[PDB]
Amino acid sequence: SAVKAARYGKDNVRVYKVHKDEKTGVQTVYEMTVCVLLEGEIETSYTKADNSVIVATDSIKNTIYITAKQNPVTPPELFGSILGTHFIEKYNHIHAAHVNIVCHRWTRMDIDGKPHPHSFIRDSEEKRNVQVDVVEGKGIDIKSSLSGLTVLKSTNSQFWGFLRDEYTTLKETWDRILSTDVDATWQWKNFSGLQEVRSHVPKFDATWATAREVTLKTFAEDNSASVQATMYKMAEQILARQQLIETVEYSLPNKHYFEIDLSWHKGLQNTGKNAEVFAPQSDPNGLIKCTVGRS
Template sequence: MPITILGQNQYGKAENRVVKITRDGATHRIKDLNVSVALSGDLDDVHYSGSNANVLPTDTTKNTVFAFAKEHGIDSAEQFGMALARHFVEETEPISTARIRIEEYAWERIATPEGEAPHSFVRQGRETRTAQITYDGTGFQILSGLKGLTVLNSTDSEFWGYIKDRYTTLKEDYDRILATDVSAVWRHEWSGRDGEEAPEWQSSYESVREIMLGAFARTYSLSLQQTLYRMGAEVIEGKPELAEIRFAMPNKHHFKVDLEPFGVKNETADGAVYIAADRPYGLIEATVLRDGAEALIPLDLTNL
Protein backbone atom coordinates (compact mmCIF):
# COMPACT_ATOMS: atom_id res chain seq x y z
CA MET A 1 0.00 0.00 0.00
CA PRO A 2 1.39 3.47 -0.87
CA ILE A 3 2.02 5.76 2.06
CA THR A 4 1.83 8.99 0.04
CA ILE A 5 -0.86 10.61 -2.09
CA LEU A 6 -0.89 13.72 -4.23
CA GLY A 7 -2.34 16.84 -2.64
CA GLN A 8 -3.38 20.19 -4.06
CA ASN A 9 -1.36 21.11 -7.11
CA GLN A 10 -1.20 23.60 -9.96
CA TYR A 11 1.18 24.65 -12.70
CA GLY A 12 1.59 27.43 -15.22
CA LYS A 13 3.87 30.15 -16.53
CA ALA A 14 4.74 32.91 -14.07
CA GLU A 15 5.63 36.56 -14.66
CA ASN A 16 4.89 37.05 -18.34
CA ARG A 17 5.80 40.70 -18.96
CA VAL A 18 3.34 42.09 -21.50
CA VAL A 19 3.48 45.62 -22.88
CA LYS A 20 0.59 46.56 -25.20
CA ILE A 21 0.71 49.77 -27.20
CA THR A 22 -2.57 51.09 -28.61
CA ARG A 23 -2.24 53.75 -31.28
CA ASP A 24 -4.88 56.35 -31.96
CA GLY A 25 -3.16 58.36 -34.64
CA ALA A 26 -0.22 60.15 -33.06
CA THR A 27 -1.57 59.53 -29.56
CA HIS A 28 -0.57 56.25 -27.99
CA ARG A 29 -1.74 54.41 -24.87
CA ILE A 30 0.31 51.89 -22.93
CA LYS A 31 -0.61 48.90 -20.76
CA ASP A 32 2.27 47.28 -18.87
CA LEU A 33 1.38 44.01 -17.10
CA ASN A 34 3.11 41.16 -15.31
CA VAL A 35 0.83 38.12 -15.79
CA SER A 36 1.10 34.77 -13.98
CA VAL A 37 -1.01 31.76 -14.97
CA ALA A 38 -1.80 28.81 -12.67
CA LEU A 39 -3.87 25.84 -13.89
CA SER A 40 -5.32 22.90 -11.94
CA GLY A 41 -7.52 19.94 -12.79
CA ASP A 42 -7.05 16.31 -13.82
CA LEU A 43 -3.29 16.23 -13.38
CA ASP A 44 -2.67 13.17 -11.21
CA ASP A 45 -1.03 11.12 -13.99
CA VAL A 46 1.68 13.63 -14.77
CA HIS A 47 2.76 13.52 -11.13
CA TYR A 48 2.47 9.76 -10.62
CA SER A 49 3.72 8.41 -13.95
CA GLY A 50 5.07 11.39 -15.88
CA SER A 51 2.36 11.16 -18.55
CA ASN A 52 1.87 14.55 -20.18
CA ALA A 53 -1.40 13.59 -21.90
CA ASN A 54 -3.40 16.12 -19.84
CA VAL A 55 -0.74 18.82 -19.75
CA LEU A 56 -1.02 22.07 -21.68
CA PRO A 57 2.62 23.22 -21.91
CA THR A 58 3.51 26.27 -19.87
CA ASP A 59 5.07 27.67 -23.06
CA THR A 60 1.60 27.52 -24.61
CA THR A 61 0.13 29.48 -21.71
CA LYS A 62 2.82 32.11 -22.25
CA ASN A 63 1.99 32.33 -25.95
CA THR A 64 -1.71 32.61 -25.12
CA VAL A 65 -1.09 35.59 -22.85
CA PHE A 66 0.68 37.50 -25.62
CA ALA A 67 -1.80 36.47 -28.32
CA PHE A 68 -4.76 37.54 -26.18
CA ALA A 69 -3.12 40.92 -25.56
CA LYS A 70 -3.15 41.46 -29.32
CA GLU A 71 -6.46 39.79 -30.21
CA HIS A 72 -8.59 40.94 -27.26
CA GLY A 73 -6.76 44.06 -26.10
CA ILE A 74 -6.33 45.10 -22.48
CA ASP A 75 -9.06 47.36 -21.16
CA SER A 76 -8.27 46.47 -17.55
CA ALA A 77 -6.32 43.87 -15.60
CA GLU A 78 -9.58 42.26 -14.51
CA GLN A 79 -11.05 42.05 -18.01
CA PHE A 80 -7.84 40.60 -19.44
CA GLY A 81 -7.53 38.05 -16.65
CA MET A 82 -11.15 36.96 -17.07
CA ALA A 83 -10.66 36.33 -20.78
CA LEU A 84 -7.56 34.24 -20.13
CA ALA A 85 -9.07 32.24 -17.27
CA ARG A 86 -12.22 31.41 -19.23
CA HIS A 87 -10.15 30.34 -22.24
CA PHE A 88 -7.94 27.92 -20.32
CA VAL A 89 -10.87 26.23 -18.57
CA GLU A 90 -13.27 26.07 -21.50
CA GLU A 91 -10.74 25.18 -24.22
CA THR A 92 -8.58 22.64 -22.34
CA GLU A 93 -10.69 19.72 -21.11
CA PRO A 94 -8.45 18.44 -18.27
CA ILE A 95 -8.22 21.95 -16.76
CA SER A 96 -11.02 22.70 -14.30
CA THR A 97 -9.75 25.89 -12.64
CA ALA A 98 -7.55 28.73 -13.85
CA ARG A 99 -6.11 31.46 -11.66
CA ILE A 100 -4.61 34.56 -13.24
CA ARG A 101 -2.56 36.99 -11.16
CA ILE A 102 -1.68 40.37 -12.62
CA GLU A 103 0.41 43.33 -11.60
CA GLU A 104 -0.08 46.53 -13.59
CA TYR A 105 2.58 49.24 -13.78
CA ALA A 106 1.36 52.75 -14.43
CA TRP A 107 2.85 55.17 -16.95
CA GLU A 108 2.01 58.81 -17.52
CA ARG A 109 2.67 61.03 -20.49
CA ILE A 110 5.73 63.26 -20.33
CA ALA A 111 4.79 66.92 -20.03
CA THR A 112 6.65 69.34 -22.29
CA PRO A 113 6.37 73.12 -22.76
CA GLU A 114 4.23 72.34 -25.80
CA GLY A 115 1.87 70.11 -23.78
CA GLU A 116 1.69 66.39 -23.08
CA ALA A 117 3.85 64.29 -25.39
CA PRO A 118 1.53 61.96 -27.34
CA HIS A 119 3.83 58.95 -27.29
CA SER A 120 6.47 59.59 -24.60
CA PHE A 121 5.93 58.23 -21.10
CA VAL A 122 7.49 58.17 -17.65
CA ARG A 123 6.81 55.50 -15.03
CA GLN A 124 4.62 56.90 -12.30
CA GLY A 125 6.01 56.80 -8.80
CA ARG A 126 2.76 55.41 -7.43
CA GLU A 127 1.43 52.06 -6.31
CA THR A 128 1.28 48.84 -8.31
CA ARG A 129 -2.22 47.72 -9.20
CA THR A 130 -2.96 44.01 -8.71
CA ALA A 131 -5.69 41.58 -9.71
CA GLN A 132 -6.37 37.88 -9.20
CA ILE A 133 -8.98 36.22 -11.41
CA THR A 134 -10.10 32.65 -10.71
CA TYR A 135 -12.53 30.77 -12.96
CA ASP A 136 -13.86 27.25 -12.30
CA GLY A 137 -16.13 26.82 -15.30
CA THR A 138 -19.23 28.13 -13.51
CA GLY A 139 -18.21 31.54 -12.18
CA PHE A 140 -15.44 33.98 -11.38
CA GLN A 141 -13.85 35.18 -8.16
CA ILE A 142 -12.32 38.62 -8.75
CA LEU A 143 -9.83 40.09 -6.29
CA SER A 144 -8.63 43.59 -7.12
CA GLY A 145 -5.94 45.35 -5.17
CA LEU A 146 -2.83 47.45 -4.89
CA LYS A 147 0.54 47.40 -3.19
CA GLY A 148 3.22 49.96 -2.48
CA LEU A 149 0.80 52.84 -1.81
CA THR A 150 3.04 54.93 0.46
CA VAL A 151 1.19 57.39 2.70
CA LEU A 152 2.20 59.60 5.64
CA ASN A 153 0.49 61.83 8.17
CA SER A 154 2.94 64.25 9.80
CA THR A 155 0.66 64.75 12.83
CA ASP A 156 -2.76 63.67 14.20
CA SER A 157 -1.29 60.37 15.37
CA GLU A 158 -0.59 59.13 18.90
CA PHE A 159 0.52 55.88 20.52
CA TRP A 160 0.20 55.41 24.27
CA GLY A 161 -1.56 53.32 26.94
CA TYR A 162 -0.03 50.03 25.76
CA ILE A 163 1.18 47.08 27.84
CA LYS A 164 4.53 47.70 29.53
CA ASP A 165 6.75 44.95 30.90
CA ARG A 166 10.40 44.77 31.89
CA TYR A 167 11.45 44.63 28.22
CA THR A 168 9.50 47.75 27.18
CA THR A 169 11.65 50.75 26.31
CA LEU A 170 9.34 52.55 23.85
CA LYS A 171 8.19 55.93 25.12
CA GLU A 172 4.59 57.02 24.78
CA ASP A 173 4.07 59.48 21.94
CA TYR A 174 1.25 62.04 21.71
CA ASP A 175 2.23 63.60 18.39
CA ARG A 176 3.99 61.27 16.01
CA ILE A 177 4.46 60.63 12.31
CA LEU A 178 2.25 57.83 10.96
CA ALA A 179 3.52 56.31 7.73
CA THR A 180 2.89 53.02 5.94
CA ASP A 181 3.03 51.20 2.62
CA VAL A 182 -0.51 49.98 1.98
CA SER A 183 -1.10 46.58 0.43
CA ALA A 184 -4.79 45.83 -0.01
CA VAL A 185 -6.96 43.26 -1.77
CA TRP A 186 -10.73 43.55 -2.12
CA ARG A 187 -13.27 40.98 -3.26
CA HIS A 188 -16.11 41.80 -5.61
CA GLU A 189 -19.52 40.22 -5.00
CA TRP A 190 -19.92 39.85 -8.78
CA SER A 191 -19.25 36.33 -10.07
CA GLY A 192 -20.76 36.40 -13.56
CA ARG A 193 -23.15 33.54 -12.68
CA ASP A 194 -26.41 35.47 -12.57
CA GLY A 195 -26.05 37.45 -15.79
CA GLU A 196 -25.44 40.70 -13.93
CA GLU A 197 -23.29 43.19 -15.81
CA ALA A 198 -19.67 43.23 -14.67
CA PRO A 199 -18.37 46.29 -12.80
CA GLU A 200 -16.45 48.97 -14.62
CA TRP A 201 -13.11 47.80 -13.29
CA GLN A 202 -11.03 50.93 -13.81
CA SER A 203 -13.46 53.35 -12.19
CA SER A 204 -14.08 50.87 -9.36
CA TYR A 205 -10.35 50.72 -8.66
CA GLU A 206 -9.94 54.49 -8.69
CA SER A 207 -12.94 54.89 -6.38
CA VAL A 208 -11.60 52.40 -3.81
CA ARG A 209 -8.19 54.07 -3.88
CA GLU A 210 -9.76 57.51 -3.38
CA ILE A 211 -11.84 56.30 -0.43
CA MET A 212 -8.81 54.68 1.23
CA LEU A 213 -6.70 57.81 0.88
CA GLY A 214 -9.50 60.02 2.19
CA ALA A 215 -10.01 57.79 5.23
CA PHE A 216 -6.29 57.77 5.98
CA ALA A 217 -6.13 61.56 5.80
CA ARG A 218 -9.23 62.16 7.94
CA THR A 219 -8.60 59.65 10.74
CA TYR A 220 -7.07 61.00 13.94
CA SER A 221 -5.09 57.88 14.76
CA LEU A 222 -4.47 56.35 18.16
CA SER A 223 -3.07 53.22 16.49
CA LEU A 224 -2.31 52.01 12.99
CA GLN A 225 -4.93 49.31 13.58
CA GLN A 226 -7.58 52.00 14.06
CA THR A 227 -6.55 53.73 10.84
CA LEU A 228 -6.58 50.43 8.94
CA TYR A 229 -10.08 49.63 10.14
CA ARG A 230 -11.44 53.06 9.22
CA MET A 231 -9.96 52.75 5.71
CA GLY A 232 -11.56 49.34 5.24
CA ALA A 233 -14.88 50.34 6.80
CA GLU A 234 -15.25 53.37 4.55
CA VAL A 235 -14.47 51.26 1.48
CA ILE A 236 -17.08 48.64 2.38
CA GLU A 237 -19.65 51.28 3.34
CA GLY A 238 -19.05 53.24 0.14
CA LYS A 239 -18.80 50.33 -2.30
CA PRO A 240 -21.85 48.01 -2.00
CA GLU A 241 -20.44 45.71 -4.70
CA LEU A 242 -17.57 44.69 -2.39
CA ALA A 243 -17.79 41.97 0.28
CA GLU A 244 -14.42 42.26 2.02
CA ILE A 245 -11.10 44.04 1.94
CA ARG A 246 -7.84 42.85 3.44
CA PHE A 247 -4.86 45.03 4.38
CA ALA A 248 -1.20 44.48 5.19
CA MET A 249 0.30 47.73 6.50
CA PRO A 250 3.84 47.97 7.88
CA ASN A 251 4.42 50.73 10.38
CA LYS A 252 7.18 52.82 8.77
CA HIS A 253 8.66 54.10 12.01
CA HIS A 254 10.01 57.64 12.26
CA PHE A 255 11.97 58.34 15.42
CA LYS A 256 13.04 61.76 16.61
CA VAL A 257 16.81 62.13 16.47
CA ASP A 258 18.56 62.77 19.79
CA LEU A 259 20.32 66.09 19.23
CA GLU A 260 20.94 66.83 22.93
CA PRO A 261 24.65 65.88 22.64
CA PHE A 262 25.01 68.86 20.30
CA GLY A 263 23.10 71.22 22.59
CA VAL A 264 20.10 71.24 20.24
CA LYS A 265 16.54 70.59 21.36
CA ASN A 266 14.57 68.53 18.83
CA GLU A 267 11.02 69.59 19.71
CA THR A 268 7.95 68.54 17.73
CA ALA A 269 6.36 71.98 18.04
CA ASP A 270 9.35 73.59 16.36
CA GLY A 271 9.47 71.12 13.50
CA ALA A 272 11.41 68.06 14.61
CA VAL A 273 13.99 66.05 12.69
CA TYR A 274 13.36 62.31 12.39
CA ILE A 275 15.24 59.23 11.28
CA ALA A 276 13.22 56.91 9.03
CA ALA A 277 13.87 53.32 10.14
CA ASP A 278 13.30 50.72 7.43
CA ARG A 279 13.57 47.61 9.67
CA PRO A 280 12.52 45.99 11.84
CA TYR A 281 8.96 47.24 11.49
CA GLY A 282 5.58 46.54 12.98
CA LEU A 283 3.29 44.75 10.52
CA ILE A 284 -0.45 45.24 10.92
CA GLU A 285 -2.80 42.91 8.99
CA ALA A 286 -6.57 42.66 9.13
CA THR A 287 -9.68 41.98 7.08
CA VAL A 288 -12.76 44.22 7.10
CA LEU A 289 -15.96 42.42 6.09
CA ARG A 290 -19.47 43.41 5.19
CA ASP A 291 -21.68 42.10 8.00
CA GLY A 292 -22.73 38.55 7.09
CA ALA A 293 -20.03 38.07 4.43
CA GLU A 294 -17.62 35.13 4.54
CA ALA A 295 -13.89 35.84 4.67
CA LEU A 296 -12.41 34.33 1.49
CA ILE A 297 -9.25 36.38 0.83
CA PRO A 298 -6.09 34.51 1.82
CA LEU A 299 -4.33 35.81 4.92
CA ASP A 300 -1.02 36.02 3.05
CA LEU A 301 -1.10 38.90 0.58
CA THR A 302 2.51 38.59 -0.51
CA ASN A 303 1.77 36.48 -3.59
CA LEU A 304 -1.20 38.45 -4.87
Protein backbone atom coordinates (compact mmCIF):
# COMPACT_ATOMS: atom_id res chain seq x y z
CA SER A 1 0.00 0.00 0.00
CA ALA A 2 1.19 3.60 -0.51
CA VAL A 3 0.11 7.08 0.65
CA LYS A 4 -1.55 8.75 -2.28
CA ALA A 5 -2.59 11.92 -0.41
CA ALA A 6 -2.37 13.24 3.10
CA ARG A 7 -3.25 16.37 4.91
CA TYR A 8 -3.49 17.29 8.57
CA GLY A 9 -3.90 20.25 10.89
CA LYS A 10 -6.32 22.11 13.24
CA ASP A 11 -10.00 22.69 12.71
CA ASN A 12 -12.48 24.83 14.58
CA VAL A 13 -10.08 27.40 15.93
CA ARG A 14 -12.15 30.24 17.28
CA VAL A 15 -10.41 33.66 17.20
CA TYR A 16 -11.55 37.05 18.36
CA LYS A 17 -9.54 40.20 17.83
CA VAL A 18 -10.36 43.78 18.96
CA HIS A 19 -8.91 46.97 17.45
CA LYS A 20 -8.94 50.11 19.65
CA ASP A 21 -8.76 53.62 18.21
CA GLU A 22 -7.04 55.45 21.10
CA LYS A 23 -8.00 58.89 19.65
CA THR A 24 -11.77 58.43 19.11
CA GLY A 25 -12.40 55.62 21.71
CA VAL A 26 -14.14 53.55 18.99
CA GLN A 27 -13.54 49.73 19.18
CA THR A 28 -14.03 47.22 16.31
CA VAL A 29 -14.29 43.49 16.82
CA TYR A 30 -13.59 40.57 14.43
CA GLU A 31 -14.51 37.00 15.21
CA MET A 32 -13.63 33.97 12.95
CA THR A 33 -13.31 30.31 12.93
CA VAL A 34 -10.20 29.08 11.26
CA CYS A 35 -9.04 25.76 9.82
CA VAL A 36 -5.45 25.03 8.67
CA LEU A 37 -4.45 21.87 6.92
CA LEU A 38 -0.89 21.25 5.77
CA GLU A 39 0.66 18.93 3.12
CA GLY A 40 4.22 18.06 2.25
CA GLU A 41 6.86 15.51 2.92
CA ILE A 42 4.99 13.84 5.81
CA GLU A 43 4.26 10.30 4.53
CA THR A 44 6.65 8.75 7.07
CA SER A 45 4.49 9.83 10.03
CA TYR A 46 1.80 7.52 8.60
CA THR A 47 3.98 4.63 7.34
CA LYS A 48 6.92 4.46 9.81
CA ALA A 49 5.63 6.23 12.91
CA ASP A 50 8.11 9.03 12.29
CA ASN A 51 6.74 12.02 14.22
CA SER A 52 9.83 14.13 13.45
CA VAL A 53 8.12 15.43 10.33
CA ILE A 54 4.95 16.60 12.22
CA VAL A 55 4.39 20.29 13.11
CA ALA A 56 1.99 19.45 15.96
CA THR A 57 -1.62 20.51 15.41
CA ASP A 58 -1.35 22.20 18.86
CA SER A 59 1.51 24.30 17.38
CA ILE A 60 -0.61 25.16 14.34
CA LYS A 61 -3.28 26.58 16.79
CA ASN A 62 -0.53 28.65 18.60
CA THR A 63 0.57 30.06 15.21
CA ILE A 64 -2.91 31.11 14.32
CA TYR A 65 -3.14 33.28 17.50
CA ILE A 66 0.38 34.65 17.10
CA THR A 67 -0.29 35.58 13.44
CA ALA A 68 -3.54 37.35 14.36
CA LYS A 69 -1.69 39.21 17.10
CA GLN A 70 1.00 40.46 14.67
CA ASN A 71 -1.02 41.10 11.53
CA PRO A 72 -4.35 42.44 10.32
CA VAL A 73 -7.18 39.99 10.35
CA THR A 74 -9.12 41.85 7.69
CA PRO A 75 -9.86 41.34 4.91
CA PRO A 76 -9.82 37.56 5.45
CA GLU A 77 -8.34 36.96 2.02
CA LEU A 78 -5.14 38.81 3.23
CA PHE A 79 -5.08 37.16 6.69
CA GLY A 80 -5.51 33.67 5.06
CA SER A 81 -2.67 34.32 2.62
CA ILE A 82 -0.32 35.53 5.37
CA LEU A 83 -1.16 32.50 7.52
CA GLY A 84 -0.70 29.94 4.67
CA THR A 85 2.50 31.57 3.43
CA HIS A 86 4.00 31.41 6.94
CA PHE A 87 3.81 27.59 6.98
CA ILE A 88 5.33 26.92 3.51
CA GLU A 89 8.14 29.46 4.21
CA LYS A 90 8.91 28.35 7.76
CA TYR A 91 9.02 24.56 7.23
CA ASN A 92 11.15 23.24 4.36
CA HIS A 93 9.20 19.97 4.07
CA ILE A 94 5.75 21.60 4.12
CA HIS A 95 4.76 22.44 0.53
CA ALA A 96 1.08 23.39 0.77
CA ALA A 97 -1.20 25.13 3.26
CA HIS A 98 -4.99 25.09 3.02
CA VAL A 99 -6.61 27.85 5.11
CA ASN A 100 -10.39 28.04 5.64
CA ILE A 101 -11.82 31.08 7.54
CA VAL A 102 -15.47 31.64 8.45
CA CYS A 103 -16.17 35.26 9.49
CA HIS A 104 -19.01 35.83 11.97
CA ARG A 105 -21.06 39.00 12.02
CA TRP A 106 -20.53 41.53 14.79
CA THR A 107 -22.45 44.53 13.58
CA ARG A 108 -22.08 47.88 15.45
CA MET A 109 -25.28 48.67 17.45
CA ASP A 110 -27.11 51.89 16.80
CA ILE A 111 -28.39 53.39 19.99
CA ASP A 112 -30.76 56.37 19.85
CA GLY A 113 -29.84 56.85 16.17
CA LYS A 114 -26.07 56.90 16.53
CA PRO A 115 -23.36 54.14 16.31
CA HIS A 116 -22.13 52.82 19.66
CA PRO A 117 -18.32 52.83 20.17
CA HIS A 118 -18.00 49.31 21.67
CA SER A 119 -21.38 47.40 21.41
CA PHE A 120 -22.25 44.85 18.71
CA ILE A 121 -25.09 42.63 17.64
CA ARG A 122 -25.09 39.35 15.69
CA ASP A 123 -27.52 40.58 12.99
CA SER A 124 -27.75 37.38 11.07
CA GLU A 125 -26.14 33.97 10.74
CA GLU A 126 -24.88 34.99 7.26
CA LYS A 127 -21.09 34.25 6.97
CA ARG A 128 -18.29 35.67 4.86
CA ASN A 129 -15.79 32.89 4.09
CA VAL A 130 -12.48 32.33 2.39
CA GLN A 131 -10.56 29.28 1.18
CA VAL A 132 -6.85 30.11 0.57
CA ASP A 133 -4.59 27.40 -0.89
CA VAL A 134 -0.90 28.34 -0.71
CA VAL A 135 1.22 25.90 -2.76
CA GLU A 136 5.00 26.17 -2.77
CA GLY A 137 6.03 27.32 -6.26
CA LYS A 138 2.47 27.74 -7.61
CA GLY A 139 1.20 30.82 -5.86
CA ILE A 140 -2.02 31.53 -3.93
CA ASP A 141 -5.53 30.51 -4.99
CA ILE A 142 -8.28 32.35 -3.18
CA LYS A 143 -11.99 31.41 -3.22
CA SER A 144 -14.15 34.01 -1.47
CA SER A 145 -17.80 33.33 -0.53
CA LEU A 146 -20.93 34.32 1.24
CA SER A 147 -23.25 31.80 2.77
CA GLY A 148 -26.35 31.59 4.97
CA LEU A 149 -28.11 34.50 3.33
CA THR A 150 -31.76 33.50 3.59
CA VAL A 151 -34.28 35.27 1.45
CA LEU A 152 -37.87 34.92 0.36
CA LYS A 153 -40.15 36.55 -2.16
CA SER A 154 -43.89 36.07 -2.06
CA THR A 155 -44.62 36.60 -5.76
CA ASN A 156 -42.88 37.27 -9.12
CA SER A 157 -41.63 33.80 -9.46
CA GLN A 158 -42.87 31.28 -12.08
CA PHE A 159 -42.10 27.73 -13.11
CA TRP A 160 -43.76 26.51 -16.31
CA GLY A 161 -42.68 24.80 -19.52
CA PHE A 162 -40.71 21.92 -17.96
CA LEU A 163 -40.53 18.32 -19.31
CA ARG A 164 -43.72 16.34 -18.60
CA ASP A 165 -43.75 12.61 -18.74
CA GLU A 166 -45.15 9.67 -16.78
CA TYR A 167 -42.97 10.51 -13.71
CA THR A 168 -44.44 14.11 -13.54
CA THR A 169 -47.13 15.30 -11.14
CA LEU A 170 -45.99 18.85 -10.59
CA LYS A 171 -48.35 21.53 -11.96
CA GLU A 172 -47.21 24.53 -13.96
CA THR A 173 -47.43 27.82 -12.18
CA TRP A 174 -47.23 31.53 -13.01
CA ASP A 175 -47.09 32.74 -9.43
CA ARG A 176 -45.29 31.04 -6.53
CA ILE A 177 -43.21 31.66 -3.45
CA LEU A 178 -39.40 31.44 -3.93
CA SER A 179 -37.16 31.11 -0.93
CA THR A 180 -33.50 30.12 -0.73
CA ASP A 181 -30.29 30.14 1.34
CA VAL A 182 -27.61 31.74 -0.85
CA ASP A 183 -24.19 30.08 -1.11
CA ALA A 184 -22.10 32.14 -3.60
CA THR A 185 -18.39 31.72 -4.27
CA TRP A 186 -16.10 33.86 -6.48
CA GLN A 187 -12.78 32.51 -7.45
CA TRP A 188 -9.80 34.87 -7.91
CA LYS A 189 -7.09 34.76 -10.51
CA ASN A 190 -4.06 32.92 -9.19
CA PHE A 191 -1.81 35.30 -7.32
CA SER A 192 1.98 34.98 -7.53
CA GLY A 193 2.47 35.40 -3.79
CA LEU A 194 1.82 37.71 -0.86
CA GLN A 195 3.05 40.90 -2.55
CA GLU A 196 0.48 40.46 -5.32
CA VAL A 197 -2.31 39.76 -2.79
CA ARG A 198 -1.37 42.87 -0.87
CA SER A 199 -1.50 44.93 -4.02
CA HIS A 200 -5.26 43.93 -4.50
CA VAL A 201 -6.36 44.44 -0.89
CA PRO A 202 -9.06 47.11 -1.54
CA LYS A 203 -10.76 44.85 -4.10
CA PHE A 204 -11.65 42.00 -1.56
CA ASP A 205 -14.15 43.93 0.60
CA ALA A 206 -15.49 45.82 -2.45
CA THR A 207 -16.18 42.62 -4.41
CA TRP A 208 -17.83 40.88 -1.41
CA ALA A 209 -20.13 43.97 -1.19
CA THR A 210 -20.86 43.85 -4.94
CA ALA A 211 -21.60 40.17 -4.86
CA ARG A 212 -24.00 40.57 -1.96
CA GLU A 213 -25.71 43.63 -3.52
CA VAL A 214 -26.09 41.86 -6.92
CA THR A 215 -27.50 38.72 -5.31
CA LEU A 216 -30.06 40.81 -3.38
CA LYS A 217 -31.18 43.15 -6.19
CA THR A 218 -31.39 40.41 -8.78
CA PHE A 219 -33.44 38.16 -6.50
CA ALA A 220 -35.81 40.97 -5.62
CA GLU A 221 -36.29 42.38 -9.16
CA ASP A 222 -36.10 39.39 -11.46
CA ASN A 223 -39.45 38.09 -12.63
CA SER A 224 -37.98 34.66 -12.23
CA ALA A 225 -38.49 31.87 -14.79
CA SER A 226 -36.66 29.33 -12.62
CA VAL A 227 -33.97 29.27 -9.96
CA GLN A 228 -31.58 28.31 -12.83
CA ALA A 229 -32.40 31.39 -14.80
CA THR A 230 -32.25 33.80 -11.86
CA MET A 231 -28.93 32.58 -10.56
CA TYR A 232 -27.30 32.91 -14.01
CA LYS A 233 -28.17 36.60 -14.07
CA MET A 234 -26.50 37.10 -10.69
CA ALA A 235 -23.32 35.29 -11.78
CA GLU A 236 -23.14 37.18 -15.10
CA GLN A 237 -23.28 40.54 -13.37
CA ILE A 238 -20.55 39.81 -10.79
CA LEU A 239 -18.17 38.64 -13.54
CA ALA A 240 -18.82 41.86 -15.39
CA ARG A 241 -18.09 44.11 -12.36
CA GLN A 242 -14.74 42.43 -11.32
CA GLN A 243 -12.19 41.45 -13.94
CA LEU A 244 -9.87 39.59 -11.47
CA ILE A 245 -12.57 36.91 -10.82
CA GLU A 246 -12.33 33.88 -12.99
CA THR A 247 -15.45 31.90 -12.00
CA VAL A 248 -18.65 32.49 -9.96
CA GLU A 249 -20.40 29.51 -8.41
CA TYR A 250 -23.91 29.50 -6.85
CA SER A 251 -25.52 26.72 -4.96
CA LEU A 252 -29.21 27.40 -4.12
CA PRO A 253 -31.76 25.32 -2.31
CA ASN A 254 -35.34 25.73 -3.45
CA LYS A 255 -37.13 25.73 -0.03
CA HIS A 256 -40.68 24.80 -0.92
CA TYR A 257 -43.82 26.39 0.48
CA PHE A 258 -46.90 24.26 -0.39
CA GLU A 259 -50.48 25.45 -0.97
CA ILE A 260 -52.95 23.96 1.51
CA ASP A 261 -56.35 22.90 0.10
CA LEU A 262 -58.96 23.75 2.72
CA SER A 263 -61.97 23.32 0.50
CA TRP A 264 -63.04 20.11 2.37
CA HIS A 265 -63.86 22.51 5.26
CA LYS A 266 -66.96 24.70 4.57
CA GLY A 267 -65.68 25.21 0.98
CA LEU A 268 -62.91 27.51 2.23
CA GLN A 269 -60.84 28.88 -0.70
CA ASN A 270 -57.07 28.83 -0.10
CA THR A 271 -55.58 27.79 -3.50
CA GLY A 272 -54.48 29.52 -6.71
CA LYS A 273 -55.34 33.19 -6.47
CA ASN A 274 -57.05 32.52 -3.12
CA ALA A 275 -53.87 31.13 -1.38
CA GLU A 276 -53.01 32.94 1.83
CA VAL A 277 -51.99 30.17 4.24
CA PHE A 278 -49.11 27.87 3.14
CA ALA A 279 -47.15 25.02 4.69
CA PRO A 280 -43.35 25.46 4.68
CA GLN A 281 -41.68 22.16 3.78
CA SER A 282 -38.58 21.22 5.82
CA ASP A 283 -37.61 18.52 3.34
CA PRO A 284 -37.09 17.47 0.58
CA ASN A 285 -35.69 20.44 -1.30
CA GLY A 286 -34.60 21.42 -4.77
CA LEU A 287 -30.82 21.87 -5.09
CA ILE A 288 -29.64 23.94 -8.09
CA LYS A 289 -25.91 24.61 -8.83
CA CYS A 290 -24.07 26.56 -11.52
CA THR A 291 -20.45 27.56 -12.23
CA VAL A 292 -20.21 30.47 -14.67
CA GLY A 293 -16.99 31.72 -16.25
CA ARG A 294 -15.70 33.90 -19.08
CA SER A 295 -16.42 32.95 -22.80
